[PDB]
Amino acid sequence: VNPTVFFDIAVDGEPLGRVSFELFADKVPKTAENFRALSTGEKGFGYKGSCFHRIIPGFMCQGGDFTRHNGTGGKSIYGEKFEDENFILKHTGPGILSMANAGPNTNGSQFFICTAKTEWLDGKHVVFGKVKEGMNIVEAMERFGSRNGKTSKKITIADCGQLE
């Protein structure tokens, strides 16, 4: 019942490795479905080609901004911005996929992949998935970041779609 989408990551054009995600349909069906439709482009837009504009080593890797590509864009499929489905799932550790919002009730397309346990974000950010395979490929995108978010090389989602 849990949709499975993936990102083929690239560093400076070069494909780095694949990173698949479970879209927790049962716990977060509104939020995970968004990522699912955004991953396919069957909505007309989505994450394909987008980059990870903000990567902070030991914290997380943030992407999803396919409109302005920096933190100020992105638009969900329920329009432009949907309310946080719930906060049932906590940021329990590396691999956790959660929504990157701009103040409560503002989920769009931005998301972040955790590279450590971020319990402080519990209740503030909607957890909706987790790295299945390639969590080492996300630890690969880790090094090309810094304290402030800014990445060295250009981390991009080469392709994307659903596998199961």
């Binding site: 914290f59 943030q62 933190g71 990157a100 701009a102 402080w120």
Partner: peptide
């Protein structure tokens, strides 16, 4: 601007 902190 979007993006979690800490």
């Amino acid at each position: 601007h979007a993006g979690p902190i800490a």
